[PDB]
Amino acid sequence: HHNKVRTCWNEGRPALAGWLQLPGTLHAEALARLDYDAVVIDMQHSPIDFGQVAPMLIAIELGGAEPFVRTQVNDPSDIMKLLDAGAYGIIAPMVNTRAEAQTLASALHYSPRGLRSFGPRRPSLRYGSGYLAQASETVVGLAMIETREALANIDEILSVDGIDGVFIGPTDLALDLGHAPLVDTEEAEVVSAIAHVRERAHAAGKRVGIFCGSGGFARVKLAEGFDFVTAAPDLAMLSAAARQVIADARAL
Amino acid sequence: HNKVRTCWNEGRPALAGWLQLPGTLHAEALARLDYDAVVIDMQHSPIDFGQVAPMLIAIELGGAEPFVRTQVNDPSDIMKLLDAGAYGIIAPMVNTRAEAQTLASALHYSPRGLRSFGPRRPSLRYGSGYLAQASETVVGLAMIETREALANIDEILSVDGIDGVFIGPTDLALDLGHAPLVDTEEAEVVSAIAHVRERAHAAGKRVGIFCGSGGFARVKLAEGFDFVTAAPDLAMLSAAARQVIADARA
Amino acid sequence: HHNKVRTCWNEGRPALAGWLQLPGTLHAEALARLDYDAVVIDMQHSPIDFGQVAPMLIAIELGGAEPFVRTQVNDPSDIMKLLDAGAYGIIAPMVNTRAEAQTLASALHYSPRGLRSFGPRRPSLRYGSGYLAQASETVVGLAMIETREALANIDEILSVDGIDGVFIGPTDLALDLGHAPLVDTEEAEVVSAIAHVRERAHAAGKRVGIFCGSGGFARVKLAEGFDFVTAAPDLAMLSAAARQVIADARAL
Amino acid sequence: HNKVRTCWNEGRPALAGWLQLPGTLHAEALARLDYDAVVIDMQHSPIDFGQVAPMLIAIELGGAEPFVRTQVNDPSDIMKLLDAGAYGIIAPMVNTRAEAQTLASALHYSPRGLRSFGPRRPSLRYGSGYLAQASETVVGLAMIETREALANIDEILSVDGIDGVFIGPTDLALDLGHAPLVDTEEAEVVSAIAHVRERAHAAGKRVGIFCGSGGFARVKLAEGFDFVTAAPDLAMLSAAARQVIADARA
Amino acid sequence: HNKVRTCWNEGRPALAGWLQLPGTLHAEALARLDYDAVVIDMQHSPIDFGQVAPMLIAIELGGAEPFVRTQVNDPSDIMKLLDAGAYGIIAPMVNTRAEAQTLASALHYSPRGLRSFGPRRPSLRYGSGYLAQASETVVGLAMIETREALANIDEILSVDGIDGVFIGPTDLALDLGHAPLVDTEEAEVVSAIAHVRERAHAAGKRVGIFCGSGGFARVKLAEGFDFVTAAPDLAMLSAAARQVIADARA
Amino acid sequence: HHNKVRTCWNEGRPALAGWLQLPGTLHAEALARLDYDAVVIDMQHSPIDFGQVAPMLIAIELGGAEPFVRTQVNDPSDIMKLLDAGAYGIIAPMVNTRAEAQTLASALHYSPRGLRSFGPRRPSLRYGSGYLAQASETVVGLAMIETREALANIDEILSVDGIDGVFIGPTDLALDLGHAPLVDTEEAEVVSAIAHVRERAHAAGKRVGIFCGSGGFARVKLAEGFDFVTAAPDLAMLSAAARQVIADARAL
Ligand SMILES: [Mg+2]
Ligand SMILES: [Mg+2]
Ligand SMILES: [Mg+2]
Ligand SMILES: [Mg+2]
Ligand SMILES: [Mg+2]
Ligand SMILES: [Mg+2]
């Protein structure tokens, strides 16, 4: 009867999250049982549709981790349907303006605080009769910052009461600033942009998250005071592991 | 051409992946690494027929030979996988000559076996001359994972219509009264594994083995195993995630 | 070769409809074979995606009931794809303005009456060569009224020629008015709002539907002159039935 | 712990749900009611392996022990369900001691049976010490639904590796030449059902029964049945919908 | 009523479609053409149980009798398809009287067979009086596709609980040592096919045959075949696409 | 390592494409192996959802043909998710204005040329390390012209740099102009409209495609200089073939 990421935050500690681009329940449960506070299912840069995300949310919850979704788009009706299927954290792409941040906030909260439609199929099963009283606290909402425009509008995005804060996509931010879309990019202008967003989030009393492609990059981001750190995509970790196993099998 | 059979014909072993996670994306990505084949496990996984079918397509596009470790040595199940573009079969619990003959029966059209004719995907890969070459397009391995199979190894290896045997060493360890540890050092299990390899090669047959690590796979290749699997997608992914979390949390 | 809800209406009788939040064809056919005129598949407050709705529409039609969908969102392209898969009734959420009611109407009718795209895969199989001539009559469209704004705009929503009328969500209307989201809410302000919408729909020569959580509430709504009454969600009926079976099994 | 086995160890019977409708949402909701277990029917339903797999997860999250009534007493099918987190098995058409031995063979690792080792989901629930306790994590019941099974009840009950028997009373009614009515009052069927219960308890074994109603389930619990199912999701939902329509239409 | 059985009772043969492509849309569209039945092939296709279930619904809505050609003559597989609204069964590799008896056992409730009782979809179509008429709602055909089946034709035809036999002429051609060509002119295959038809009609039983073309189907109907399939969705679609491309490219 | 449609165009030859409304991989691979340059999966006038399109794209690529998708809607996030699943051609419906053509272009190209989000799961596997350098060339984008409005705005639609050109839906264009939605319509006003669009596309140095319901109509469109010709829908070809087989089986 608590959001595990929110419990971390209430203790003044960051949350470490997994990141799934591969559909299915077995790896979802296994990774949820490791020392992850949450597991983010990526519905943007993956082949995971609604049909496949639904049982994965169940598997992550059984594993003991908070099920999160990175959506395809900041669409209120998509986000509401994931909340009612037991997604307890939302990362919405391409939040570039206050109005887009208000669109995300609108989907996370029942009236009067937003316009979330009422039919909480799975949250009512998890939280029971006392769900509606605490519904807003059961859900974490992060607006993605991955453009020049979002960078320019960061203080107006952070002024929106109904979002917990922001989630940095460093590779898309690198690409939008005219740099190589490198995994864990340390391009100086992108590093400055990322530090600026982190500073503005904490100045506004808001949370800041970041996508990492490695444990090493995630350690530095945790040391820099990021509230929500993801590492690393199941597909990238599996491909790296398989390459290494093959190299060791084939070695002289 | 069957890429495993090409390895063997060029005097080289095959290195194979091993999938317990359903889905096409990791299947294609691992197929594109330096694997000759990728085995889809339909026994110790939740992969049903519905999920295996597009995975075989994804492995083939990746450039690796799609293999299936079946739930059971059942001829009709094996025939449906062959017609869906499974070009290698590893059948569990082949403990007798008669069970090895049941496996062979499913891999070959009449007169050599009783494979039913309707090759939906092989006829697309191989074209109208598929029948003449059908037996050579498929690799069949009988699993050795019991004391009984170990006792009957010579009679299993006498069946002309299987390429040879595939050692399941965790089940073999368990059936011998030892811990079911992958890549075991247990003296009796190591002796039994070497024995099966020696008997397979003495009978002019191929021998494969399931491995949990690249380091163990290297030794098995050096010992002369024809078909070496390393390592299950789920085991590799869990180990990689544990390590990433340890690096993140210092 | 008739919409069964439209046949009820042409005889001056209301239609009684089922309501499915559980995916699958077996309960869909079984409930379609009961004394329901239609069966609504809920794609908003359920885990039912397009992949799962498609065979359910087939099952409801075989059962003898009119297949309806309550969509996730009033999106024309979503609604058109359901019509071409054999959805013969559409209930669109969050129709708060005339322009939003015009967006719903646009999806239900071929040019010149709307902008429905032509490729009627399943309706052409049901209706045969005479489909295009009667296509608009084969489909029932209802705009959902579940906000203060929709209540304020009810006469402008009802002025849209291409919708059959409106569908009241009483629980969301209760929540949006600052009341408890109760099943079959009788909160006085919500009861007044609901009676107002019914009066305005019938004054405009339009149909009014309502969601019910019970047979008892549905009987009253039919007695009040509602044209389209749903009762009750498969999940709620199944959970209530299971609770009662367990209570009888465990009794002294 | 296996929640049915905990009931039994604390001298209480288990009350179970029964699912013929595929999907996770009703499975979790019913699991969260006062059911000790929820049986997924893979025989008299359209539930295939693809659909059962996430349902077992949903029941476990709900707090109930996930059970499966299989299509057939097939060892390889049963082993794949155990490795997907089925913690109870009800196998149809167990008519002989040999068929009861086939069921037991699938539930236990060597030396006690021939269960293949690769416990994907049980190793996640139970951790690295799963092998030592694997047999106790699983409840196995042989179905009694024929005159033959009734005649062979003592020989079926002599098999040490099954917890006991599960009466399918509609099929038993049909095979005795009576109407296949659930919760039957047919004198001969009631006598046969009481006989099976008496013989199971005399052999120190558990007895279960399929029920169509809460009222019949109450009597079966009062008679000393260890495992009582009431009632199928489809039958409960159809009855509830008929009643709602009758109330709506006056 | 079973629409194939209605044809037969009115002294007419049935013409059937044949589906190797999964999905409901083509299944309903072809069901609405002048086919009496539509066979879903679960052997030489990637159609699993998950995909067959909604296809049976789609064919029934179309107005044609839904049939399944199973992967194997397995009673439990056949019973699950009957309870999902398969109203015709074509079982492969029926080579002996005992195998024909195994098919009959699955199609009939006790006392006539051992069909398990839980008719989910037939009870919705036929209502509470389904048991009394269940056997007549289902058409059962044993496949003849081997020299052995040909040799045992009289003993196969002696089994009262099958409507008759279904010739698989490509497999029969292959097992006789000929090219597995559909609609073959091979003298010995044509003689064997006529022989099976003559023996089926002499025993008061029905005979069906798989055809690759409308022209061959016309001849088989003129020869007195009771159940004629023409032609597989995949073969018809590929031929149609080749022709469209030839017309487009001049 | 080339888009097969783009290779045709670079040789000054048109591409011939298949058209799939039936879900599944087996017919997709079989048709891909015929003398088609591409195979279009229709996600608008079909029951094919994302879950079903994903393995079909794999099957078409294995067959040797370029996998294309006709989307349900011109939605950037939908189009991006198909590109990352190995859709290498996009046909977007209801492009009626320059701004709508700019919305399509925005989804097909990484920054600076558009705003495509970076996570190319399947294109990175096909193209390897040299993908980002050539990413825009790997993808073909066509705006659908199927309304009066699109016809009126054809030169403004064709002025958008980031689209290869346009795709004519002749049946929807017939319907929107107040004519019968006939397969391969030769309604004089529709034939004039279609010739006008073809002339304007080639005057702007842009490509023009067209949907055909027959090989005979496709031959004429190729002879008229259309760059991209589809013929014919799998469902229509299969139903026609089945009718003919039945007629031959039943003939005296
Ligand atoms: Mg609402
Ligand atoms: Mg055959
Ligand atoms: Mg259109
Ligand atoms: Mg084993
Ligand atoms: Mg039974
Ligand atoms: Mg992005």
Side-chain angles (χ1 to χ4, degrees), chain E residues 1-13 136 206:
Chain E
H1 55 88
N2 188 300
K3 296 202 170 60
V4 168
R5 213 176 273 289
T6 294
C7 290
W8 291 349
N9 294 337
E10 292 181 357
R12 297 201 61 176
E136 292 318 276
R206 302 286 173 184

Side-chain angles (χ1 to χ4, degrees), chain A residues 109-111 113 116 118 120 127-138, chain C residues 175 180-181:
Chain A
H109 304 283
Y110 296 127
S111 194
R113 192 171 175 196
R116 186 182 168 190
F118 191 78
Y127 280 94
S129 68
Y131 175 62
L132 178 67
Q134 70 180 121
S136 292
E137 293 317 278
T138 69
Chain C
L175 186 54

Side-chain angles (χ1 to χ4, degrees), chain F residues 121-200:
Chain F
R121 294 293 81 81
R122 292 206 54 252
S124 64
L125 296 179
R126 181 172 167 184
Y127 280 94
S129 68
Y131 175 62
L132 178 67
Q134 70 180 121
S136 292
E137 293 317 278
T138 69
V139 174
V140 165
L142 299 176
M144 283 192 76
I145 309 295
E146 45 172 348
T147 74
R148 288 182 176 286
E149 186 175 16
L151 181 66
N153 294 336
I154 186 54
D155 295 322
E156 91 175 13
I157 293 157
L158 292 165
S159 76
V160 175
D161 296 340
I163 66 174
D164 294 291
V166 292
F167 187 83
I168 294 173
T171 300
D172 271 320
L173 187 59
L175 186 54
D176 200 58
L177 289 169
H179 304 292
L182 296 183
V183 174
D184 297 335
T185 176
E186 305 198 42
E187 179 71 43
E189 175 176 19
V190 184
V191 171
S192 286
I194 292 168
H196 174 67
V197 173
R198 192 205 70 82
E199 283 166 29
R200 298 319 300 151

Side-chain angles (χ1 to χ4, degrees), chain C residues 49-51 54 75 77-78 81 84-85 110-112 114-121 132, chain F residues 21 42-49 52 72-73 94 146 171-172 175-177 180-181 235:
Chain C
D49 74 336
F50 194 93
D75 175 72
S77 72
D78 287 349
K81 192 182 186 163
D84 296 328
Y110 296 127
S111 194
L115 44 71
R116 186 182 168 190
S117 192
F118 191 78
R121 294 293 81 81
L132 178 67
Chain F
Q21 291 165 350
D42 187 347
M43 291 187 76
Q44 180 181 41
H45 292 299
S46 83
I48 303 171
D49 74 336
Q52 293 184 111
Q72 177 188 306
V73 59
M94 290 296 278
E146 45 172 348
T171 300
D172 271 320
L175 186 54
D176 200 58
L177 289 169
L235 174 57

